[PDB]
Amino acid sequence: SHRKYEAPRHGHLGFLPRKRAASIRARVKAFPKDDRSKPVALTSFLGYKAGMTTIVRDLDRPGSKFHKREVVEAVTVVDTPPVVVVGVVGYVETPRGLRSLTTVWAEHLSDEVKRRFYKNWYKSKKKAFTKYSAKYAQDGAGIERELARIKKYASVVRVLVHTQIRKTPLAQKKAHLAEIQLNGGSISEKVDWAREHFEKTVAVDSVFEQNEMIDAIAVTKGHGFEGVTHRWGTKKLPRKTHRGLRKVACIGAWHPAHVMWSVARAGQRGYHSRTSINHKIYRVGKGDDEANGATSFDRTKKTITPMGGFVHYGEIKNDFIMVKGCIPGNRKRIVTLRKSLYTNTSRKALEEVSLKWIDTASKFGKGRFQTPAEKHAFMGTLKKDL
Amino acid sequence: SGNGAQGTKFRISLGLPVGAIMNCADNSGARNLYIIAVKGSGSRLNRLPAASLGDMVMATVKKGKPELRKKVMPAIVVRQAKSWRRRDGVFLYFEDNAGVIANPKGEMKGSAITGPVGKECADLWPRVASNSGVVV
Amino acid sequence: MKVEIDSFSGAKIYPGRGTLFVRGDSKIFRFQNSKSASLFKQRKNPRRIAWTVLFRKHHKKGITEEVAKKRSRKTVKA
């Protein structure tokens, strides 16, 4: 029969399977189309989600009721310490896709990136890249020829970087490693840029800039085995319902005499790798600066870090990216940012943004004050203080 | 929404589904209004059409003049009592739900409005802005 | 952007923080939290709540704001 009242599919059949991701670091499945004219820089960065705060700014939209009027918005903060470059590899093209033929590494690998190659570091000779390190020290022989191989082939070049996890307040010590595709020009120049940057760091100011729209790629918060009602968004069945109401009543018809893939079933919720686009950068911030949270209008020397810290993360003593809105992932999670795959004008991706004020009040409560000095000047002296 | 709408409106949270009753803030002789439709509302299964501050609705009068009772008429919501967000971050609410009687192209059957009204309604209905004293 | 003041507790309200209540008499109260909003709806008096600026004013706590004025002692000199 001819369903009595039509209505749309609950859920998206394109974010299937709603399965746990293979890694905690989501993988960039598409970098931007290249231009062989620009200089050489990266297309992505790695950071760690810290949390959120609140942002006030004057809006610039010729036609809105709130034009040249102050609106408050939500942003998220990505701790983005300088990222170290260790190696590149060369992907060449085949009728079976792109394929790597060489991985060139650097001589001195740090003890926070040569832990990524171990599952038990505390008992080990650490014996990694020891022979690849002695592959140097004869002038450039076995390394320069590999790089020449890359230049002679390799329509695509990718740089292997690792995070400086030891600068964050996390207790992990095991740096995240990742390939990032260069979209400069002259693959020779690409690999030469890489070779110059081996054992050296790239800051995020060199990649991103204010008012730049980006995409965030991260593994989303895990919630576990969930039922169909919250996982897919189905109706709760009524109260007078035997054997449960948080279910899907009819899971198919007699013929086709099978349960279909299109039917809402119970299972994993979260820990999916998601990719969310068109998130404007509202600030690119430096850890070589107090007054990261100060502005042109506020001018109070405060960091971006709220009072009591960011909840479950800590402080932001490094550089950071303050980007509009909510992004995939929970705090303490490795995010990978990506420049956009297309130029969006749209009169909202071109709005030039200047912040007025930033909320540094505690997110561990209904925080009253933004600053301990504000707090002291309001409350006055207390029994503790002299 | 529609005919007498001077401009657009940002989304603000829904507080007045059909079957709801809100007081009548004008002097047309009606004491309450009973909401039975919302102009501009979509169509989802089992969803109730629901009105917000500034929305136009179809109403009946339950208490008031017999000249007005027992017929459906248009109306406008001027107070919500649900908290709604303004883009300047302000969450705000009134202590009561209220509307006025009106014609389809925006004019009021009354001459005055008791109590405050929302700026999101004054912006969208000027005849409500005219006969409004206090706009918040 | 202004920093409004809580109509029950005298706290400072920063943007996007708290609520606003418009009473039928068109008076606007501003609350920094659900605590002070709830005490308002429970129609308590802030002069009896011990953590409020109004109480502390009424009871002279942190009362080093204004002290006194002098008395005039001088000739006309003209």
Place this chain on the structure above:
RNA sequence: GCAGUCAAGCGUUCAUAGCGACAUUGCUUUUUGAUUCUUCGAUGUCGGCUCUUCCUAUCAUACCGAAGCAGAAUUCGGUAAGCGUUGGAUUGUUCACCCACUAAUAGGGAACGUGAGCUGGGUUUAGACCGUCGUGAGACAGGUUAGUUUUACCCUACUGAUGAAUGUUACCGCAAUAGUAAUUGAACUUAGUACGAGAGGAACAGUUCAUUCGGAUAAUUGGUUUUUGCGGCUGUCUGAUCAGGCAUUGCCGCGAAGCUACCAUCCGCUGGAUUAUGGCUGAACGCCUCUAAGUCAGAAUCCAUGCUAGAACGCGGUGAUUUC
């Protein structure tokens, strides 16, 4: 039920803009019957709720063609089933009938989908009332009231989750295959302009917003409270106090964190090949002709980009590879 052929006539004039009698050819199986093949050592026989998918004979939306199409609204028709198709009063109702919104409120199928998914209002046991019929026991697709809805722990399928073997082990990756998602509308301006005697009255581009859907998130607001966190209150018990027990979380208020809501916030890509249709060149048919060769543009179409998994028997690169 639906669609064709023919065309006497209606349509001011005119058969075929739109309709179309007398006749006739057909399709379908969402009607009702006919039949009795299967099932009586039982396939749980109404309806709604819920959920998915499919069809197209397309209601709306995209692009078009024709008009008895000036504009506006409307009618006919094509490609198209991509995406949508509601809220309620009454009724058990399917059907129906009205109120209202809407872009529209299209029709159907899946054992007349769906009862180890619900419910059980109806029919269809046993109780009981009425009316008619019957001498009567009792009968009545005649009304009325009350009337037990069992089992999954097996196999498969589905949703998720591990895992032996490929020298071991670890890191970075490719991407066959499969899936796929965005949708619709209003206001301003275009412009009281075009059009039209006037009444009336558009459209493209642009801007701002919203509807439906979806994926995240929790700064804020709200909700939640065994933080049994802080306070308060009752009754009793610990001789009083202080501090506490019991009241199956004793109750009240506030309540961080976490979870969470169109009850909150953010986000939701741009390129190619085509359909219908309109065209170019251009014969066939010395003319003409979008067509036959060839070719242009072009839809919400299709394929990619992008997005989701990653073949546990698809692949690659790289690091380190055990001696008493």
Place this chain on the structure above:
RNA sequence: CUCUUAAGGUAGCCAAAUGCCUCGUCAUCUAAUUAGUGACGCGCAUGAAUGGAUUAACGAGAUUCCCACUGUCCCUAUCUA
């Protein structure tokens, strides 16, 4: 006026738990009512201890509406054992 019966349904009551046609007709209740109530009555097939018509109080009886109340619902979320 006529046929005719043993007599030809009186008082009352009614689309009633009894009315097929039937979602009867008018009104009222509703924005909208096959529901309800009040009226009408050629009543397929009401009706007088087969008891008829009423009826205060009573009813785990059937039924409609109003107020209040609410997670029944919009629309779901959270918490404890």
Place this chain on the structure above:
RNA sequence: GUGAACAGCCUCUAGUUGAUAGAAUAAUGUAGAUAAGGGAAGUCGGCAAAAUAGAUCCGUAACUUCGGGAUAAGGAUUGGC
């Protein structure tokens, strides 16, 4: 003891401390609860739940078999010293 009360709640005398345990705290359940704004739009049907509740004072209709209806409806107060 509270309290109208062999109500419910705590305690003395007496009696038990039995009922397979441990570890975690996923869905779905069972039992129990809470919920912005709305307020029966849900459903055959307000099923279920909520709301009300004691005592004192005030006030109390239609109808009636004059006995009732009646705690009608509906309002206010309540602690400690």
